[PDB]
């Protein structure tokens, strides 16, 4: 019963907590599990000038966006995960639940 809670997020320190919760509450029912397997972070990037024309010296703004991923791997029934997931998440992160 391989199940994969793949967490994608923009937040470094709300993610941390939502992946913790899933592992705090797996070992009380106690159903054996893999550990937090990360992925390589992406910085998208856009650059632009600052002005509404072409006047002045040419200065440059540089807008980033670090986009941060986790994943954790369960051996458990999917009805057991209906309970688990819906219990307590937060706005910073959205959760996927790969079933097999």
């Amino acid at each position: 019963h391989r199940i994969r809670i793949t967490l994608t997020s923009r937040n470094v320190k709300s993610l941390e907590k939502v992946c913790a919760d899933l592992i705090r509450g797996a070992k009380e029912k106690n159903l054996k599990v893999k550990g937090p397997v990360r992925m390589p972070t992406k910085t998208l990037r856009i650059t632009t000038r600052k002005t509404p024309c072409g006047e002045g010296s040419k200065t440059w703004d540089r807008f980033q966006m670090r986009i941060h991923k986790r994943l954790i791997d369960l051996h458990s029934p999917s009805e057991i995960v209906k309970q688990i997931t819906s219990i307590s998440i937060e706005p910073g992160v959205e959760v996927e639940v790969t079933i097999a």
Partner: peptide, 19 residues
């Protein structure tokens, strides 16, 4: 949706919905 988009493309068309 049906055609299945990109996560970059997905996390950004989020931002433009909000604004």
């Amino acid at each position: 949706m049906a055609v299945q988009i990109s996560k970059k493309r997905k996390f950004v068309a989020d931002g433009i919905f909000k604004a």
